[PDB]
Write a protein that binds this ligand. Structure first.
Ligand SMILES: CCOP(=O)(O)OC[C@H]1O[C@@H](n2cnc3c(N)ncnc32)[C@H](O)[C@@H]1O
Length: 664
């Protein structure tokens, strides 16, 4: 087809897979027809095992059919390993002077080249602080509320070393969102930093943590706090007895505790991390990832989707508060001994050339970013890109949202000067790593398509009418019909909800996305089919936004829908009703918007607020009829469907008239 972009010749010669699509298809076919042998070989080849699984022909067991019993998957049962050991110790001392992170702060005067040897020292130091000053034991939960600095990777790996369970809270979340996650995870310890900065704006991490910790204590929790010195100590307060500066904890270490810390050898299905993730229903829930399968899957996808070789220099722009930073900043890259760029700042400070200054300075060859960022760079204009030397780039990656042809072409042919392959990687928190993706050198690309499934992955298109598999070119519900090593194993404390959310169609993992498969077998992701939003690349649920809106004292109820937004991809549209007698003013609407930002964070800011004067559209039971609100927010006033269940049909006329006025 004419929209196909061939892989570059040079990448084809370098590829771990081969120079032609036939090479990929040969491996893919093997990974399905001989699935256990495939993963056994990869696992043995590329990872360290203290103990291996007993049988190469049965490295997985599973059930995807609720009628046969509980849903479950297990990978490498019987094997024993450690993620920190694979990320760090095993590379030493051979690679002690190899750079692990080229770190730069938000402030371009702040830089450090952190070697693998230095990471080892930093990690054994912190692990010993955790074990012997905080008494952190295997299985204990530790919360992280950190900026993108070396200490963030150190903290993740130190917890893995001792078998603690991390839960990472994105630094953009508010105190209330942080507290909620610490409460649900029952963290014994919060690791944070004094402060960071986003361009010109200070980010007062410990000050926010103080409010979250006060809220947790008022509910009876006792959470200690360890604070890294990222700035000058003078942005935050410290509570005697609860809060410790990391430098003070370091000083208490014995000399030996700077050189060695025992490794906790983990069983395959021991929990590695909990990641709170927005869903179609209810508040964010903790997705559970275990040890052996996730380790293998995050690392193997990193290697093949980006074709990482030891002479490559890798830069992913994601934060550790989201799954992309787990799999594709810290765990996967370090397990394959990558040299990476670690960047605390933002793409527009000091100006929109910053990421390209990083690419040139560190000779980056693989850049993994997101369409929201790409759209913002495009809007800033090509001259911010072209002042940078991009000759070293050979692979560009995109994650988290659909990317249109114009942005894809701009990424490759302006950003990458037309000498790069592009890996548009589709996957989710629940899948651990990439699921549908190009591979450099061997995969013809279609701009806008994720292309072909990763090795071992069997996607299907389910018919939205009767929910069976569709053959041939087809559009419908995206599902996965067989297990893969990186699959999340449960929702923390609520396996019933896990089965209900993802396994409602027996035999399939239901993604929540829709997709079209074309006549070449390439997949085109068309977005969520449930109520989940994708706002500036952040996955957010309508329920926490509505719950946040409803905490404003004047608000009776609300309903949130998404709408197309040029920069954010999807914006947040709020319909809401106020108590009888409320004076509706611009200041009131501003206070409701600020309430959402207080309860959740800036990432959930409403873009439009429409006052439903008579009420939200609702059935006799009280159920808000959301399709009505969806159609209105788009201007489509004739395609609403049926309203006969509306206890208050008077509401409709008001909703269309108001929208025409606001003109979103
Ligand atoms: C890794 C982030 O994982 P999550 O934060 O859990 O968001 C997962 C959700 O992002 C969306 N998505 C992710 N990658 C793509 C892509 N390449 N093209 C289109 N849409 C994408 C999709 O809707 C999915 O279900």
């Amino acid at each position: 087809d004419s929209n196909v972009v061939e892989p570059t010749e040079a990448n084809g010669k370098k590829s771990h897979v081969g120079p032609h699509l036939g090479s990929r298809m040969r491996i893919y076919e093997y990974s399905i027809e001989h699935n256990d042998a495939f993963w056994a070989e990869i696992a043995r080849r590329d990872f360290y095992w203290k103990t291996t699984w007993p049988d190469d022909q049965h490295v997985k067991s599973y059930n995807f059919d609720k009628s046969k019993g509980p849903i479950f998957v297990k990978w490498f049962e019987g094997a024993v390993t450690n993620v920190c050991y694979n990320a760090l110790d095993r590379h030493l001392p051979a690679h002690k002077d190899r750079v692990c992170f080229y770190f730069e702060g938000n402030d371009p005067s702040v830089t450090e080249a952190v070697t693998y040897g230095s990471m080892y020292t930093r990690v054994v130091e912190l692990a010993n602080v955790l074990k012997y000053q905080y008494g952190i034991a295997k299985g204990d939960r530790v919360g992280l509320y950190l900026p993108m600095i070396p200490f963030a990777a150190v903290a993740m790996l130190a917890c893995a070393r001792i078998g603690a369970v991390i839960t990472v809270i994105f630094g953009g979340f508010s105190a209330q969102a942080l507290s909620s996650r610490l409460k649900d995870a029952q963290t014994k310890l919060l690791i944070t930093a004094d402060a960071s900065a986003r361009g010109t704006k200070p980010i007062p991490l410990k000050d926010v943590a103080d409010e979250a910790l006060k809220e947790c204590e008022e509910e009876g929790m006792s959470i200690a706090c360890l604070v890294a010195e990222n700035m000058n100590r003078q942005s935050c307060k410290m509570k005697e007895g609860r809060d410790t500066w990391y430098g003070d904890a370091l000083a208490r270490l014995t000399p030996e505790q700077h050189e060695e810390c025992p490794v906790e050898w983990m069983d395959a299905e021991d929990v590695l991390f909990l990641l709170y993730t927005s869903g179609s229903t209810g508040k964010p829930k903790a997705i559970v990832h275990t040890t052996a399968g996730y380790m293998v899957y995050a690392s193997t996808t990193f290697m093949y989707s980006f074709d990482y070789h030891m002479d490559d220099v890798y830069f992913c722009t994601a934060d550790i508060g989201w799954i992309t930073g787990h799999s594709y900043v810290v765990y996967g890259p370090m397990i394959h001994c990558a040299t990476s760029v670690l960047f605390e700042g933002v793409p527009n400070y000091p100006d929109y050339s910053r990421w390209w200054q990083l690419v040139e300075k560190y000779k980056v060859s693989i850049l993994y970013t997101a369409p929201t960022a790409i759209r913002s760079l495009m809007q800033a204009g090509d001259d911010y890109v072209k002042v940078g030397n991009r000759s070293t780039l050979r692979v560009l990656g995109s994650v988290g949202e659909p990317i249109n042809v114009e942005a894809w072409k701009w990424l490759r042919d302006v950003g990458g000067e037309g000498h790069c392959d592009v890996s548009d990687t589709w996957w989710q928190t629940e899948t651990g790593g990439h699921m549908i993706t190009p591979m450099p050198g061997c995969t013809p690309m279609k701009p806008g398509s994720a292309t072909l499934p990763f090795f071992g992955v069997q996607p299907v298109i389910l018919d939205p009418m009767k929910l069976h598999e569709k053959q041939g070119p087809a559009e419908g519900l995206l599902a996965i019909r067989a297990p893969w090593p990186g699959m999340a194993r449960t929702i923390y404390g609520d396996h019933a909800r896990f089965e209900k959310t993802y396994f409602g169609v027996d035999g399939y993992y239901m993604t929540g996305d829709g997709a079209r498969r074309d006549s070449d077998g390439y997949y085109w992701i068309t977005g969520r089919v449930d109520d989940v939003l994708n706002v500036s690349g952040h996955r957010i649920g309508t329920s926490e936004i509505e719950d946040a809106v409803n905490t404003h004292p004047a608000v009776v109820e609300s309903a949130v829908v998404g709408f197309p937004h040029n920069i954010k991809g999807e914006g947040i549209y709020v319909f809401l009703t106020f108590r009888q007698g409320t004076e509706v003013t611009p200041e009131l609407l501003a206070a409701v918007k600020a309430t959402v930002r207080k309860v959740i964070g800036p990432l959930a800011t409403p873009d439009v607020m429409q006052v439903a004067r008579v009420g939200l559209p609702k059935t006799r039971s009280g159920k808000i009829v959301r399709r009505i609100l969806r159609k209105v927010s788009a201007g489509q006033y004739t395609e609403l469907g049926d309203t006969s269940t509306l206890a208050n049909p008077d509401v409709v006329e008001d909703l269309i008239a108001e929208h025409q006025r606001l003109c979103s």
